[PDB]
Amino acid sequence: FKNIDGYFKIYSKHTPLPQGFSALEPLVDLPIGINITRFQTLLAAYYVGYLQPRTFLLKYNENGTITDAV
Amino acid sequence: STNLVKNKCVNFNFNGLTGTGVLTESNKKFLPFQQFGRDIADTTDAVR
């Protein structure tokens, strides 16, 4: 999940934290804009990692999918 | 909107972006969220 000029993007994937690569296709984008400085969860165990502006080198394979990154 | 012509150099206009070239059936596997192929030179190589 991320927010840029209010636009709220979501990406996800069904992977059946292990190794390997599995790029997250977007599913929804909410174009309204909320000033967000919190996060919660309603309903087990889960994981959380934050994001930084980090230049990446993406390896699109021949079928067009991100199969590896740097 | 007009009809679609393949195998001929045409002056196409998809969703407001102009261009010129031959349109063909592509086997590229666009994922449901992608609408454009792109070249090394930021040239639209394929479209939806």
Binding site: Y11, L17, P18, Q19, G20, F21, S22, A23, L24, E25, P26, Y47, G49, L51, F56, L57, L58, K59, Y60, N61, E62, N63, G64, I66, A69 | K28, F30, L31, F33, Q34, Q35, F36, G37, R38, I40, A46
Partner: peptide, 23 residues
């Protein structure tokens, strides 16, 4: 607690198809 993110968090940055290119 804590865990290591091995190679996770990779997502398609834009809605532009690309192929055999190291973008």
């Amino acid at each position: 607690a804590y865990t290591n993110s091995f190679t996770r968090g990779v997502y398609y940055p834009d809605k532009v198809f690309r192929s055999s290119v190291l973008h």
